[PDB]
Ligand binder design. Sequence first.
Ligand SMILES: [Ca+2]
Ligand SMILES: [Ca+2]
Lengths: 144, 64
Amino acid sequence: DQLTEEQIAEFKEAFSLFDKDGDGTITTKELGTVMRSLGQNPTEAELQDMINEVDADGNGTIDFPEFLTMMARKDTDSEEEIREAFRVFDKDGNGYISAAELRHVMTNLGEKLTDEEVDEMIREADIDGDGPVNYEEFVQMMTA
Amino acid sequence: NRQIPAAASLIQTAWRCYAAENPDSSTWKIYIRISQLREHHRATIKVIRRMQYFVAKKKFQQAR
Ligand SMILES: [Ca+2]
Ligand SMILES: [Ca+2]
């Protein structure tokens, strides 16, 4: 890509928001205050899950360098994983999911998106009339 | 098949992380606790969504 810009300035303010006390580290409590603030009710299981995925070493908290690494992130590899996750609902594995099936798993299981996000999502792939949605289209539209 | 909810959820997280790069997406409507969405909110929400993705990445690798 490019050398990070004045986004340095942006990401540090963002790290500021979780780092309530300025100790240059973000803890599960600190992430938990922010999320509940947002009306979310995460488990001390979930917080530790998020924390571990960005703690490069293992001091069990996030410093700013790790934070930067996280907000600066994978060629085709991250593309292939989503492309796989769709293939799990590709019944025949043709390469198309139905709009109804897509809508259904999107609304009814996993993170249970809302009816009006599925709409934005089906609408971002201009379906060939009433046709089945090509999800490889989706995945390129997403990553690029 | 236990690869389903981990699959379902990696699409859902991937797309929520993509949508939030749009300041007029319906994805901002889920935040019914916050009365009006300031930028410092959208800051922390893009961070929480990226964390939530890297977990869903790790949990899908483990079922794939
Ligand atoms: Ca702190
Ligand atoms: Ca650390």
